[PDB]
Design an enzyme around this catalytic site. Structure first.
Site, PDB file in Angstrom:
ATOM      1  N   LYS A 237      52.879  39.667  43.850  1.00 46.04           N
ATOM      2  CA  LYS A 237      51.789  40.099  44.743  1.00 46.04           C
ATOM      3  C   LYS A 237      51.852  39.470  46.140  1.00 46.04           C
TER       4      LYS A 237
ATOM      5  CD  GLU B   7      49.192  31.968  47.082  1.00 48.37           C
ATOM      6  OE1 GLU B   7      50.246  31.315  46.981  1.00 48.37           O
ATOM      7  OE2 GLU B   7      48.702  32.607  46.126  1.00 48.37           O
TER       8      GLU B   7
ATOM      9  CG  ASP C 105      47.251  36.455  47.840  1.00 48.63           C
ATOM     10  OD1 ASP C 105      46.824  36.387  46.663  1.00 48.63           O
ATOM     11  OD2 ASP C 105      48.450  36.268  48.128  1.00 48.63           O
ATOM     12  NE  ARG C 106      45.671  34.978  42.887  1.00 46.51           N
ATOM     13  CZ  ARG C 106      45.930  35.541  41.709  1.00 46.51           C
ATOM     14  NH1 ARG C 106      44.982  36.223  41.069  1.00 46.51           N
ATOM     15  NH2 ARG C 106      47.143  35.424  41.167  1.00 46.51           N
TER      16      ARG C 106
ATOM     17  N   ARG D 187      59.265  32.700  40.755  1.00 46.01           N
ATOM     18  CA  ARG D 187      58.197  32.485  41.744  1.00 46.01           C
ATOM     19  C   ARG D 187      57.138  31.469  41.286  1.00 46.01           C
TER      20      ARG D 187
ATOM     21  NE  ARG E  44      51.409  31.543  44.401  1.00 49.95           N
ATOM     22  CZ  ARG E  44      51.881  32.752  44.114  1.00 49.95           C
ATOM     23  NH1 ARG E  44      52.558  32.959  42.994  1.00 49.95           N
ATOM     24  NH2 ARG E  44      51.674  33.759  44.950  1.00 49.95           N
TER      25      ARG E  44
ATOM     26  CD  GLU F 225      52.908  28.795  38.462  1.00 51.57           C
ATOM     27  OE1 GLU F 225      53.154  28.932  39.678  1.00 51.57           O
ATOM     28  OE2 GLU F 225      52.646  29.758  37.709  1.00 51.57           O
TER      29      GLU F 225
HETATM   30  C1  LIG Z   1      42.146  32.372  42.507  1.00 50.58           C
HETATM   31  C2  LIG Z   1      42.677  31.631  41.871  1.00 50.58           C
HETATM   32  C3  LIG Z   1      43.319  30.695  41.065  1.00 50.58           C
HETATM   33  C4  LIG Z   1      44.696  30.463  41.122  1.00 50.58           C
HETATM   34  N1  LIG Z   1      45.299  29.507  40.259  1.00 50.58           N
HETATM   35  C5  LIG Z   1      46.784  29.231  40.356  1.00 50.58           C
HETATM   36  O1  LIG Z   1      47.151  29.317  41.791  1.00 50.58           O
HETATM   37  C6  LIG Z   1      48.464  29.885  41.905  1.00 50.58           C
HETATM   38  C7  LIG Z   1      48.147  31.222  42.616  1.00 50.58           C
HETATM   39  O2  LIG Z   1      49.206  32.170  42.475  1.00 50.58           O
HETATM   40  C8  LIG Z   1      49.020  29.903  40.411  1.00 50.58           C
HETATM   41  O3  LIG Z   1      49.561  28.622  40.103  1.00 50.58           O
HETATM   42  C9  LIG Z   1      47.794  30.094  39.520  1.00 50.58           C
HETATM   43  C10 LIG Z   1      47.450  31.563  39.418  1.00 50.58           C
HETATM   44  C11 LIG Z   1      44.518  28.806  39.404  1.00 50.58           C
HETATM   45  O4  LIG Z   1      45.002  27.959  38.656  1.00 50.58           O
HETATM   46  N2  LIG Z   1      43.128  29.036  39.345  1.00 50.58           N
HETATM   47  C12 LIG Z   1      42.524  29.990  40.186  1.00 50.58           C
HETATM   48  O5  LIG Z   1      41.307  30.206  40.144  1.00 50.58           O
END
Ligand SMILES: C#Cc1cn([C@@H]2O[C@H](CO)[C@@H](O)[C@@H]2C)c(=O)[nH]c1=O
Ligand SMILES: C#Cc1cn([C@@H]2O[C@H](CO)[C@@H](O)[C@@H]2C)c(=O)[nH]c1=O
Lengths: 308, 308
Positions: free
Chosen positions: A18, A37, A111-112, A169, A171, A174
């Site tokens: 995404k 993000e 983004d989200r 991918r 982050r 992670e």
């Molecule tokens: C929005 C959001 C969030 C993203 N994340 C993380 O942040 C990164 C976003 O891609 C990933 O490691 C994982 C999806 C969370 O752990 N909690 C959240 O609420």
């Protein structure tokens, strides 16, 4: 009549592609903005390496190095941090959003959405034994009201291809966690069913009995996650305080517009898919003349300050 | 067009908010005024276990140096999320019933505390106590629900010596430091609404910081708490994300109707004092006609389920 705005929230589970998809769509630079993000807030401003803190805690819980309760307090705090830029942004945007509405003046691509950090991720960690269902419902209680023209794009991707992309991918901080992948994939699948259930006339209180034996079945919506024993009176009844949070969740989700993006293709194939998807999205008027440029600034400044 | 009066009794604990509230409800009828108590049951059982007791113990450990600030901070943030949940859903389920600002009211709702108690004042006070980050305080602030019209808030005056006395009389632990912090915080809040109703503008007065009636000096509002080094960019200005949280604070507070009640008197004294003060309070209409008994049910349901 005021200029028209198009808001587009690119959501769904992480690891489907995404960021690169919309990065590819992050390419006139003036009449369309990409709100990235808030990675810098996650690693620096709000707290030190929040993402790292999240995955370590789940891991340590998994290894039995800490308890379910310890993991919950840490997870719950972190989710406060993770969510905050999505919360502020919504709060400042809200007064500028008018009613529903031919090409638009401004397109905002986020983004989200706030429900990623206020519903979806908390619910997933609950399925992972790292958050109490009461916390999830507390976050749900604080979900900002659903403005007009709230178009959410969610992903479609077969689990194995998803694991592939996710692996490439990752982050910072992670850990590759296939149980979290399934937790989140299930949460987001339930989320899509939940919107269809609500929009087709679904009443959770009406069908709540069916969790004990032309729309989805309640056991296939997010409501099924809250037949949790923590939420229930000795006679099995939902406490009213939790039932009201379900009423809120119902209200918020029923009026979002859901669009499904098949990620199972090439990066620019996803891009074109996203552009095709826009013709069905809902535009809104803004509320003041200088709303467009104000929105534009918020967006560019969010990007500069918290973008990766 | 039936009308409604909502009054929230807030302020530092240990003043007499609860008693005074009950005396006041005890003058109406079992059909024209309803008490919305503090959800003590949610606090001790439903949402978590002995949350009040966990809060005060955690602070004691942080003080005693048995835990780090960081460990205390995650506990406090989690606890605060829980503390505020029943206020958040209550507001969320009431909001659609509330109309424009507006003789006798069809229904009066006396609340034991407003959402901002758990979403702002106690966080800010825990921040001063060194057990919460300013970042998280602002995270709670950014989640403050839109301020409904007719939001009448009654904060309390009481000399500090008399206040300490009352507290020493009575899940908690006698923390005079916490009392200073929470008294100071509610002091700033009162000033902050005044500062905002006087057309005060924090962005334009921000540089003045270091260290009814006329417009207060910004150093005497809640804005003063957030000139903290964590929140400041290399250039020494606030990060935008935090500035925007402060914009939200101003937007939420400026429309509130603040009243001060003097708790330096007897219980019936307070009741009659509070009763007089209501006379100058803003009523609102309701939306559906059947909104009034709907609202009544919800308050008695809440009280029956979460009070004592
Ligand atoms: C929005 C959001 C969030 C993203 N994340 C993380 O942040 C990164 C976003 O891609 C990933 O490691 C994982 C999806 C969370 O752990 N909690 C959240 O609420
Ligand atoms: C509402 C509320 C809150 C109450 N409290 C506490 O509730 C206790 C009541 O016994 C007091 O110590 C204090 C009012 C918090 O610590 N945080 C809150 O947000």
């Amino acid at each position: 009549k005021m200029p028209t705005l198009l808001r587009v929230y690119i959501d769904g589970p992480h690891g489907m592609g995404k960021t690169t998809t919309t990065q590819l769509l992050v390419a006139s630079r003036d009449d369309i903005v990409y709100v990235p993000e808030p990675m810098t807030y996650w690693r620096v401003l709000g707290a030190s390496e929040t993402i790292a803190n999240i995955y370590t805690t789940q891991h340590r819980l998994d290894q039995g190095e800490i308890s379910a309760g310890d993991a919950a307090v840490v997870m719950t705090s972190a989710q406060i941090t993770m969510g905050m830029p999505y919360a502020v942004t919504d709060a400042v945007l809200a007064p500028h959003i008018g009613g529903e509405a031919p090409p638009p003046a401004l397109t905002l691509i986020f983004d989200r959405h706030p429900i990623a950090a206020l519903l979806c991720y908390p619910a997933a960690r609950y399925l992972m034994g790292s958050m109490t269902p009461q916390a999830v419902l507390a976050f749900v209680a604080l979900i900002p009201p659903t403005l007009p023209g709230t178009n959410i794009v969610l992903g479609a991707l077969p689990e194995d291809r998803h694991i592939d992309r996710l692996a490439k991918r990752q982050r910072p901080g992670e850990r590759l966690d296939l149980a979290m992948l399934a937790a989140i994939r299930r949460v987001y699948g339930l989320l899509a069913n939940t919107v269809r259930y609500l929009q087709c006339g679904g009443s959770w209180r009406e069908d709540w009995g069916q969790l004990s034996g032309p729309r989805p079945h309640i056991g296939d919506t997010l409501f099924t996650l809250f037949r949790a024993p923590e939420l229930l009176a000795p006679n099995g009844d939902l406490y009213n305080v939790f039932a009201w949070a379900l009423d809120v969740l119902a209200k918020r989700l029923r009026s979002m517009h859901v669009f499904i993006l098949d990620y199972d293709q090439s990066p620019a194939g996803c891009r074109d898919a996203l552009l095709q998807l826009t013709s069905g999205m809902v535009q809104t008027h803004v509320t003041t003349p200088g709303s467009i440029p104000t929105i534009c600034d918020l967006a560019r400044t969010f990007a500069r300050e918290m973008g990766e």
